[PDB]
């Protein structure tokens, strides 16, 4: 299925993944 905002922010719970958006 498509990604969605719930699943996306779940993925960003990982600090390294969140860090991709704040280098």
């Amino acid at each position, epitope marked *: 299925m*498509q990604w*969605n*905002s719930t699943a996306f922010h779940q993925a960003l719970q990982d600090p390294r993944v969140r860090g*991709l*958006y704040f280098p």
Partner: antibody
Amino acid sequence: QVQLVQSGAEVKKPGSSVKVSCKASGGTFKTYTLTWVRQAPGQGLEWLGGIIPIFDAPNYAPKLLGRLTITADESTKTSYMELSSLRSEDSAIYYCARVGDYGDHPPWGWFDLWGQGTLVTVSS
Amino acid sequence: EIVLTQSPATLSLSPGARASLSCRASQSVNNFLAWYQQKPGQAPRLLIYDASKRATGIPARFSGSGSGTDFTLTISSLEPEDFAVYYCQQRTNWPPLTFGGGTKVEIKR
């Protein structure tokens, strides 16, 4: 000072496909830079899709999933919106828009710069 | 999907009057709401973003307020160039990102 220039009007039969382009005149450009929105005659704005940064993942309006493809050529600073299996209700002005900074809330910023629009008419 | 509902559909106001436009979300969007202006034959233009921040180039008579589900765009004193259609939009819940249905501000004479 960046400007967004879209391709010209299109006229299509039902069941066919259309590919509209949007070229940025300069500035930093990634595949995620440009999102697509449309507006049917006399109606409001409908988001078509965009590209999630980093993952470079296109994300589309559920009602068009399977029919809509958004791509971008970073070497030419051009985004492309391709919509297939066209229906009369796809008749609309199609706009490209630049997504601005998302602040602390990825993946989407706001639509801070717009193309001039491309008219697409679908009719027998 | 988060549905944005705008009210009223049309405002009829004289130049110089205050305009108050409503946008309500079916569930909370925190502050992740923006307002755009659109005139006939033109693309939309961003006015206010994240509920209350004013985009560069936008006059000081435009202000946004609200949080959660209930938002307001206020034009403190209408100029002739302000008669137009206004849309709200949210950037937090997707797919799809959603827009309100628009409010047209037209000239009362």
